[PDB]
Amino acid sequence: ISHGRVFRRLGLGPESRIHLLQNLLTGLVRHERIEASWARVDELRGYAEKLIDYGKLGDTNERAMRMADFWLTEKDLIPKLFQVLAPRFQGQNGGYTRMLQIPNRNEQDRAKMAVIEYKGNCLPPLPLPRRDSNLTLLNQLLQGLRQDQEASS
């Protein structure tokens, strides 16, 4: 019975899972975009979203400072976290990370892998799945419906 559970089992236990998530978060902060297992990336998405909110609380916040000290193992990233990611994420409320499933790893394990990326990074854009243009047949029919609805009012 796993009803009402939000944390999945990873590593050798709870502390091992926490350490793995901390290492993944440190790598994500350092490189602005990382790729890992799909489950690991999905689990790390929440912590990545929470870290930006903690950083937005200010540099002088002792709780945020000690949280960053615990999580970001590389202490050179804490100033980066408080002076790059937080300042560039101000008007954004919860759109801090992007997660996309990539094809399975070429190794024999054939694991299901995902890639997480901080928005606004200085990296080439990923091949995001773009919607069809409005010039398509169905899109043009929907545009005609929209125009008729607008003209009806």
Binding site: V6, F7, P14, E15, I18, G46, Y47, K50, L51, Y54, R66, M67, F70, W71
Partner: peptide, 10 residues
């Protein structure tokens, strides 16, 4: 003791 629970953030 479970120190990670104070910084779990979730």
């Amino acid at each position: 003791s479970q120190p990670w629970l104070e910084f779990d953030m979730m």
